[PDB]
Amino acid sequence: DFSMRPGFGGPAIPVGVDVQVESLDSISEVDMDFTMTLYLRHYWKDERLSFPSTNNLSMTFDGRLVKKIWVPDMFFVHSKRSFIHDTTTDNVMLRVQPDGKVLYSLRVTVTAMCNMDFSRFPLDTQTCSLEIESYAYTEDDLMLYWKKGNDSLKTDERISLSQFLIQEFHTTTKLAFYSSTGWYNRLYINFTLRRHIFFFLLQTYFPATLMVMLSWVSFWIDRRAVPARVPLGITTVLTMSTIITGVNASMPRVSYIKAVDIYLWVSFVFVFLSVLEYAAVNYLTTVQERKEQDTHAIDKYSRIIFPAAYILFNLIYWSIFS
Amino acid sequence: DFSMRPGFGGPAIPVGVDVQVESLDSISEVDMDFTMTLYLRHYWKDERLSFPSTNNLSMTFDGRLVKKIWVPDMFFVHSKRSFIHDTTTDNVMLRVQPDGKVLYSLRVTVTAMCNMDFSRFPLDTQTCSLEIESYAYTEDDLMLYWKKGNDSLKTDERISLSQFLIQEFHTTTKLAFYSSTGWYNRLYINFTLRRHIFFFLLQTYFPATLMVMLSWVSFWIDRRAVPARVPLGITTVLTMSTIITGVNASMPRVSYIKAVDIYLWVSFVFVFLSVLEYAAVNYLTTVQERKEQDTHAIDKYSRIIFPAAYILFNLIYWSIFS
Amino acid sequence: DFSMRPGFGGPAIPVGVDVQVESLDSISEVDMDFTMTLYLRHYWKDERLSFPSTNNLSMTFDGRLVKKIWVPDMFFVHSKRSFIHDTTTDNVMLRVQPDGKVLYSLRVTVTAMCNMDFSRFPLDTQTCSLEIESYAYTEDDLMLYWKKGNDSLKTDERISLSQFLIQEFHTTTKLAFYSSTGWYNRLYINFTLRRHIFFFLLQTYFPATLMVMLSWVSFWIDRRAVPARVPLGITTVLTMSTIITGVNASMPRVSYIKAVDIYLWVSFVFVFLSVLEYAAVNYLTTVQERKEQDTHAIDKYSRIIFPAAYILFNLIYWSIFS
Amino acid sequence: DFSMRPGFGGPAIPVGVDVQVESLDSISEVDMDFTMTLYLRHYWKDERLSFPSTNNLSMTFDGRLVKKIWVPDMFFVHSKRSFIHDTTTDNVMLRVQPDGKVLYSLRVTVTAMCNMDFSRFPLDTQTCSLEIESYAYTEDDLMLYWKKGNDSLKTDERISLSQFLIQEFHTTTKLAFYSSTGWYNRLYINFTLRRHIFFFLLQTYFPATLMVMLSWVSFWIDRRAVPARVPLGITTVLTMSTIITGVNASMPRVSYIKAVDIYLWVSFVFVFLSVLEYAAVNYLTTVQERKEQDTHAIDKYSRIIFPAAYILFNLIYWSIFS
Amino acid sequence: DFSMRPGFGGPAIPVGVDVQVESLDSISEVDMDFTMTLYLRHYWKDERLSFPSTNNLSMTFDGRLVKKIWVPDMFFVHSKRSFIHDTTTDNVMLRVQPDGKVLYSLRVTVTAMCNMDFSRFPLDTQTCSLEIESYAYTEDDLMLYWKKGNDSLKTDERISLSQFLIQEFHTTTKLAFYSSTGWYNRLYINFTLRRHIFFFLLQTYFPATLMVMLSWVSFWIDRRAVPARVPLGITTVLTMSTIITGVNASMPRVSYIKAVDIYLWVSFVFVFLSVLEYAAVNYLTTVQERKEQDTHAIDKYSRIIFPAAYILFNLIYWSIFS
Ligand SMILES: Cl/C(=C\n1cncn1)c1ccc(Cl)cc1Cl
Ligand SMILES: Cl/C(=C\n1cncn1)c1ccc(Cl)cc1Cl
Ligand SMILES: Cl/C(=C\n1cncn1)c1ccc(Cl)cc1Cl
Ligand SMILES: Cl/C(=C\n1cncn1)c1ccc(Cl)cc1Cl
Ligand SMILES: Cl/C(=C\n1cncn1)c1ccc(Cl)cc1Cl
Ligand SMILES: CCCCCCCC
Ligand SMILES: CCCCCCCC
Ligand SMILES: CCCCCCCC
Ligand SMILES: CCCCCCCC
Ligand SMILES: CCCCCCCC
Ligand SMILES: CCCCCCCC
Ligand SMILES: CCCCCCCC
Ligand SMILES: CCCCCCCC
Ligand SMILES: CCCCCCCC
Ligand SMILES: CCCCCCCC
Ligand SMILES: CCCCCCCC
Ligand SMILES: CCCCCCCC
Ligand SMILES: CCCCCCCC
Ligand SMILES: CCCCCCCC
Ligand SMILES: CCCCCCCC
Ligand SMILES: CCCCCCCC
Ligand SMILES: CCCCCCCC
Ligand SMILES: CCCCCCCC
Ligand SMILES: CCCCCCCC
Ligand SMILES: CCCCCCCC
Ligand SMILES: CCCCCC
Ligand SMILES: CCCCCC
Ligand SMILES: CCCCCC
Ligand SMILES: CCCCCC
Ligand SMILES: CCCCCC
Numbered sequence A, B, C, D, E: 001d002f003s004m005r006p007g008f009g010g011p012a013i014p015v016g017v018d019v020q021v022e023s024l025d026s027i028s029e030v031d032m033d034f035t036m037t038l039y040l041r042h043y044w045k046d047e048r049l050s051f052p053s054t055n056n057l058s059m060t061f062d063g064r065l066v067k068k069i070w071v072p073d074m075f076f077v078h079s080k081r082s083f084i085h086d087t088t089t090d091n092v093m094l095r096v097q098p099d100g101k102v103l104y105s106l107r108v109t110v111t112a113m114c115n116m117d118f119s120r121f122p123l124d125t126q127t128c129s130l131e132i133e134s135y136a137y138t139e140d141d142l143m144l145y146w147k148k149g150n151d152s153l154k155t156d157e158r159i160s161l162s163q164f165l166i167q168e169f170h171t172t173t174k175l176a177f178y179s180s181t182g183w184y185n186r187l188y189i190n191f192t193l194r195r196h197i198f199f200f201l202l203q204t205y206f207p208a209t210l211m212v213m214l215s216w217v218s219f220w221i222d223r224r225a226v227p228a229r230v231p232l233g234i235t236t237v238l239t240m241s242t243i244i245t246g247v248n249a250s251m252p253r254v255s256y257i258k259a260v261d262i263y264l265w266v267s268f269v270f271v272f273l274s275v276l277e278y279a280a281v282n283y284l285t286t287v288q289e290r291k292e293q294d295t296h297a298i299d300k301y302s303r304i305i306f307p308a309a310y311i312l313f314n315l316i317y318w319s320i321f322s
């Protein structure tokens, strides 16, 4: 009866795992998941599978035999969807040796949930993992381990992504507990991710800075030229508002506060204050004309104060986000 | 014949349910649904499943036995789509004890319809539920209950969402009736949802307020400077219209009136009225010049009246939506 | 042989239908279809299904028996896609009575084609239907009818949609003909749909109207102030063009002429004419100065003529679309 | 052995086809394909299927018999995806007559590749086709033809599309050759498509034309009014650029040159030239003032030359695209 | 036992491949993959499949026989998803000759990963490939080759794409190694891709260039006209910012630096510098008036220097990207 595991009732059966990674097919920021294609290999010794031959060499069967014999039942923990490839036929392999050591191999694609924090965007780093576990059998019945330690993971040379950079592949293990079912062995495949920083500096942190620098030109124009100093500021407000909407249309769409939002909103406040400045100046000059019937003090102070505050802002901001 | 339930013809069979929640995979606002992955467990006593062993301990089978024996038929009420995971094999478990107490377990993902009201957006709170029912059998044949009361629900520590905050998981039960079929027992899994308010305050309720404040600067400029007071107002109208279209491009897309729409439209009316104000002033000054051949009264009254009305608006608005 | 219908060769077998509607899952305007989840019930009398019991009460089987016995073959006319739910097992029920009266029940989701006319958008009303027919058997072999007349349809209390309002559920029947196959009986489920009008009035018919009102302010400014009357009109053109593009980005995307398009284009023409007006005025004043070396007549006539024409436009427009 | 065709080894078996079209479900411009739902019927005479009855009338089986007997193997040439409907059961019909004439019928949806040329957009016309072929058997084994000539195609009265107009359904046949396999018979279903022209005239060819007409107003304003003639032109440039981006956001997205692109770019050049015109005029007047210390000739020539060139452009353009 | 290959234990079985390409269904730039539909053919000699007939001619079976006999197990290396077509029945063919030479044929669609570099966009060229391999058997058991060399690939005459141009189809072979499994034979189908350059020149490299040319007009306007030279520059900044956001909304969405980005950002810097220029000029004139109580030198130098620098930029840029 190939429904009972090898060594039933006695000690747990040692099953060993080997993995090779093919590709990383996609990543979704809004749904917080990633998709991967890999090869998965198993090993064990079963005597009901022995045969009399002198060759001392393995012999090959396929998926049809897999539905007759007994086989492990690993599954992917914290997955959203997976499948096994089937063209032009099932991507399954089964090799059987004279002494009874089986090898069993699959090709699969998995989508796995990854929790991500965007508060430092775009200067963040994300960490993700793939988890492997047996579904039905506890650690007293089935024992699970990496076949050759840290060397039981292999990775493909052309694995790439359009939005990210990948580094630091390694394996770990950990024991897990379910309250209604027991203690299970679990294996992990970990890696790290990062973005192209110097592109975001030019896409977002550059136009805003130029706009704030453009609002300071007003302090050097003659206060007598009202039809020239009034339209300049409000057009500058318009430009900055347009920019803040273009950046939002090109970003992934997240609804809590991010690093880049802070910088843009502060630049906006600097440009709004410049408009209030000249309104004060105009009003004071006008009441002086009325009272009686050279650069203004507020102009020659603004020319110093505004840039220095912006410089202080930048120092603190980049001390916090580094 | 494992087509007749245990206890056929006599009294109803008691079946008990246990649940553990894995993840919340996605939420759709336009279609009004959510997607969830969970583990589902059942329990009962059947004597046709007894076997002679002294061990007083459970013994394990899998999905192939499930197609031979009799098994409950629960289903998900008010679901749009669901499925059972099958890699690397069916995520199914079956454990059978010497006295005949069966345990049966599945891994599944469900999308369930949730009715939502957006009239208070973005200050709303949404309530959603998952419902479990037997398809074929009434309460006189099958009896359904939570195995250990309020403690029959377990939830994962890293359950998270990018747009929402989750709280208040608990269980309830209720009897249900179909007119052509009878009375059935139903179980419920309830929870609550909310948004990040202080992000929306800065994304939407901040730029508009600054714009209305910018339209008030006009009352302090000299009425003699026509080429300076005329372009200011119409450029301010342009800026506010641009803003009202950016917010609409970044929101989920709903076609009845929402809280945030009201605030934006009222700000728009304030800016339109400021333009009509100076047109009155200009016309009156001009006819005075013609008649005959200092700040105007309407200017020095507007400087008080406009801000006070806006303050009254804000008081009432936040008294209504709190 | 359960491949021959009950009453083969003699008279047609009467089969009766009962329906209960669960939810309306989605609607697509571009592809012209809707998606629905319902319960579907059948009834008939078959003697090969009789059994000797005294109970005078029905007894329950499930989907496995359905593959052995004979069963109707209804299908959904003018559907694009459908399916039967299968978690945690097939959503199928079969109840069999001592005298041989079978009851058979399914849970299904269907997407059905609905032809829609958008010429009156957004003041339109759409009518849609679900059609049920037997695939293989003509009216001389199988007879199909509603079990209890108008009362054979039941509907759920919380059926809702985010963009529409639903009303007027009722049933009808009609005989249908295929040229290569014969006459068949058909059943229908009809209902009506409508939009939230007073939201569209504020989203689209309000900003344009304010813009046209803003273009009339120019007639009251002094014709001597050229740098003040020239930029006003062209900025107003810019604002109206921006608005006409935002509305188009927020609508469903249809490529023939709709009611709302007409109103927007007419407003655009009014604003373009205002610019041509002042160009005439300026030119005439200038040639007068040249000839020789008070309000202009065209100004004081425009102040009356423009609003009156707009009022005439609105009267006719709302007499046509009501 | 129902694996050998009727008439094996001798002459080819005549199989006849009949078709009725239900709906046209969708069209994709970017991927260049369309999706269709239809009924497909076959006919032939097989003697291994004869039975002794006097009725001289056909008798009905279904899909389960289809898996036992022999049946044709038609397939859809140049399809991307297809399927057969299966709710509430397989949409399959089989009718068998006393003399052995079989009728066999299916309901299916197909997506078929259609090659399209967009160079004349939006004044184009597209032609598409559906192709039917036998997969395994050459013209010496299986003979394929339309059952009743041009009358073997039927079409539904409410077939409609939201973006197109459909006309000219007819059938054709053609012999085809594969180099590694042989000569096969092929059947075709052809039709024609077109757009709503007079909507595109108003959506795209109208605003641009008004803008070019607005740039000509500048020639009639007094050259002495620099602060009035300078902002007019550059604001007009801004408006035209905005328009050219809105049209691009509402079109299907194709990356070679189209008819409508040409018209928009030429209008853009006309508006840019108007700005250069006044710059010349201003410079010449200024140097005249300097030299010494009425309408300008370039103004009164532009008033004639610009409109006449635009009229010439329109004549040629509509002579080419008609 | 048709589970052992022909020639088991002795020498490897020679299997030969032939391919014909139907269509190229789609391409995704963000996910870096392409989708293809093709016919795939195999050949070999097996004696357990011989039959006694004099005809010296092949005889036809179908997919049902394929599940009984032994058959190769090729698969698609570096694929994301594939499938075999099944309407109206499995697209499978099997022809068997008196001497035992089998022919076996399939119709399939595959999506295959293609690594792409966008740094030269839009002047890039991409190279892609399709790879074929045996899953279970090494080169000592199964030998794989192209049936007729370079002539074993055929391609369809109407293969086309909406965004690209296709050229250079040819075949290659290469031996491959897996560390846990052995050496395998691999076949390749290669081709080349390119874009429509002269469309992108007009869509992107034309408006920016005109804008930079428009910013140079300012050097020829009289420095005394402040209300005419100040609004011109800031409106030009606004126009250029708008343009840079429209291009980004119409491109595929990639997050590292591309060729076209560089050109746009440099144009932006030229327009910002023009505004700073007149601010210097105005300030110097004003202090001169104050000191004392003709074209400026910076104006007549700018008129030469700005265009020459832009010309130098273009020379270098097109020397680098050619
Ligand atoms: Cl971010 C934005 C506008 N939005 C664009 N899309 C959605 N909201 C905004 C927020 C704060 C401030 Cl200070 C200025 C601006 Cl313009
Ligand atoms: Cl909300 C909008 C424009 N739209 C943008 N997308 C769709 N409509 C609008 C509505 C009312 C008022 Cl008072 C002002 C404006 Cl700008
Ligand atoms: Cl509706 C549009 C521009 N488009 C925006 N998206 C696509 N086209 C338009 C059409 C006619 C008139 Cl009179 C004015 C305008 Cl602005
Ligand atoms: Cl069509 C476009 C801008 N784009 C908008 N989306 C993508 N590019 C443009 C092209 C040529 C000319 Cl002469 C003027 C303009 Cl504004
Ligand atoms: Cl490209 C962009 C704005 N963005 C539009 N969408 C996203 N960012 C920008 C970047 C650099 C410079 Cl110098 C100018 C501009 Cl306007
Ligand atoms: C979490 C602090 C946000 C501060 C935003 C300030 C915007 C001017
Ligand atoms: C709105 C501007 C008011 C300026 C007042 C300045 C008083 C010192
Ligand atoms: C932000 C500028 C403040 C200038 C204050 C000047 C007081 C004399
Ligand atoms: C939540 C961190 C806010 C940091 C603000 C920094 C302002 C310079
Ligand atoms: C339901 C009341 C809506 C009021 C909208 C007012 C817009 C100015
Ligand atoms: C359009 C402005 C008219 C202003 C008239 C004011 C009469 C008191
Ligand atoms: C909204 C301002 C009204 C001002 C009225 C002044 C009447 C003298
Ligand atoms: C439907 C509620 C409208 C509330 C309007 C509040 C205006 C201050
Ligand atoms: C079908 C009549 C359309 C009229 C459009 C008029 C646009 C100014
Ligand atoms: C382009 C404006 C011309 C105005 C001419 C008016 C002649 C009565
Ligand atoms: C649309 C306004 C026309 C004004 C005509 C005035 C003729 C004296
Ligand atoms: C096709 C109907 C056009 C109606 C135009 C109404 C103009 C007032
Ligand atoms: C194929 C000719 C294109 C011409 C484009 C001209 C744009 C000004
Ligand atoms: C940039 C404008 C220069 C105009 C020069 C005109 C010489 C006839
Ligand atoms: C495009 C207008 C050209 C005008 C030339 C005038 C030469 C005196
Ligand atoms: C490729 C056709 C170009 C036609 C240009 C027509 C310009 C009037
Ligand atoms: C990799 C060099 C980028 C240079 C960008 C310059 C933008 C002004
Ligand atoms: C912000 C403009 C300052 C110009 C100073 C020029 C000194 C030579
Ligand atoms: C970019 C223009 C520089 C002009 C310098 C002029 C120095 C006299
Ligand atoms: C990474 C290549 C940068 C090339 C810059 C060229 C500037 C002319
Ligand atoms: C905004 C500056 C105000 C200065 C008041 C003296
Ligand atoms: C004259 C003060 C200049 C300040 C520059 C930061
Ligand atoms: C808009 C203010 C009008 C005042 C009339 C006296
Ligand atoms: C002079 C009146 C000022 C009012 C500020 C709200
Ligand atoms: C646009 C008005 C023109 C009037 C001609 C007398």
Ligand SMILES: CCCCCC
Pocket (backbone or CB within 6 Å): C303, C304, C307
């Ligand atoms: C003086 C005429 C006013 C007209 C208002 C509609």
Ligand SMILES: CCCCCC
Pocket (backbone or CB within 6 Å): D276, D277, D280, D298
């Ligand atoms: C742009 C017109 C220039 C005329 C030179 C005489």
Ligand SMILES: CCCCCC
Pocket (backbone or CB within 6 Å): D303, D304, D307
């Ligand atoms: C005075 C010339 C007018 C030309 C109109 C096309």
Ligand SMILES: CCCCCC
Pocket (backbone or CB within 6 Å): E276, E277, E280, E298
């Ligand atoms: C921007 C030009 C400055 C020149 C200083 C002499």
Ligand SMILES: CCCCCC
Pocket (backbone or CB within 6 Å): E303, E304, E307
């Ligand atoms: C007078 C100098 C002109 C320079 C044109 C590039």
Ligand SMILES: [Cl-]
Pocket (backbone or CB within 6 Å): A227, B227, C227, D227, E227
């Ligand atoms: Cl001025």
